[PDB]
Amino acid sequence: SMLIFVKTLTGKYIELEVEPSDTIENVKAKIQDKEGIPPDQQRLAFAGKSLEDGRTLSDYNILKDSKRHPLLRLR
Amino acid sequence: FVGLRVVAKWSSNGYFYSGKITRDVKYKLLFDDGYECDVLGKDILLCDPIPLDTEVTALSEDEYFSAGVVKGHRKESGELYYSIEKEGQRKWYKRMAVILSLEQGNRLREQYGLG
């Protein structure tokens, strides 16, 4: 597992555990599960880069070591 | 405790986030992240600012949270900045970029925990 954070457009922080093999779709589903935001309406970005459907987190070089927890932002 | 600044978690194994007590009911908390929420006093640390040498988690400019140690405080325009050291390097962080892990908050409960 690895910890990531997600900031909503409400400004609220969410915490998720993910695997580097998780796809963007899986993440949006977790956001839906925790916040009730439809996948279809979530535009996830990391450091201003849009995260596209059917890639993994590892495809974007988001996930480093366990000590560093990336903040994804909804836009 | 109303009007007081606080760091508090809202989930059993979550992080502690900075906010304000808006009402005693559990306590009604407005988090600096804008989320409003009634949280147990058990989960509220009444420290403000987070004291020197506390181990915290802070959002770096590269959009990673990671652990560091509070080394200083600065209050400008009413806003609080923390100087936080990470592997020997110090940077300044806005209050809302500094949170506590469950373990990091647990270490403050005895001294600062509400109750």
Author numbering:
A (entry chain B): 0 to 74
B (entry chain A): 1486 to 1510, 1514 to 1603
Publication passage describing the model:
An alternative way to improve HDR editing rates is through downregulation or inhibition of key factors involved in competing NHEJ and MMEJ pathways, such as 53BP1 and DNAPKcs (NHEJ) or DNA polymerase theta (MMEJ). In this study, we leverage this functional screening system to assess focused libraries targeting the protein-protein interface of i53, an engineered ubiquitin derivative, and its binding target, 53BP1. Using targeted saturation mutagenesis at the i53:53BP1 binding interface and a screening process in primary human HSPCs (a cell type with intact DNA repair, DNA damage sensing responses and other cell stress sensing signaling pathways), we identified i53 variants that introduce stabilizing interactions with 53BP1 and are more potent than i53 at increasing HDR editing outcomes in HSPCs. Using these classifications, we determined that the addition of i53 variants results in an increase of HDR by specifically reducing NHEJ events but not MMEJ nor other types of outcomes, consistent to their role as 53BP1 antagonists.
We then iterated on the sequences of two top hits from these libraries (L67R and L67H) by varying the amino acids T12 and T14 simultaneously, which revealed changes that could further increase the HDR-based readout. Taking this data altogether, we chose four i53 protein variants that represent the sequence diversity observed among top performing hits (L67H, L67R, T12V.T14H.L67H, T12Y.T14E.L67R) to further characterize as protein-based HDR enhancers in HSPCs. To understand the molecular basis of the improved activity and binding of the de novo i53 variants identified in our screens, we solved crystal structures of each variant bound to 53BP1 (S2.2, S2.3, S2.4, S2.5 and S2.6). We observed that the L67R change enables a new 2.8 Å H-bond with D1550 of 53BP1, and that L67H forms a network of inter- and intramolecular H-bonds, including a water mediated H-bond to S1554 of 53BP1 and an H-bond to D64 on i53. The new interactions identified at position 67 were also present in the crystal structure for T12V.T14H.L67H and T12Y.T14E.L67R. For the T12Y.T14E.L67R structure, T14E forms a 2.6 Å H-bond to Y1502 and a 2.9 Å H-bond to the backbone amide of Y1500. The T12Y mutation forms additional Van der Waals contacts at the protein-protein interface. These analyses demonstrate that each amino acid change in the variants selected from our screen form stabilizing interactions at the 53BP1 interface, resulting in tighter binding and validating the use of this screening approach to identify gain of function protein variants.Fig. 2 i53 variants display additional molecular interactions with 53BP1.
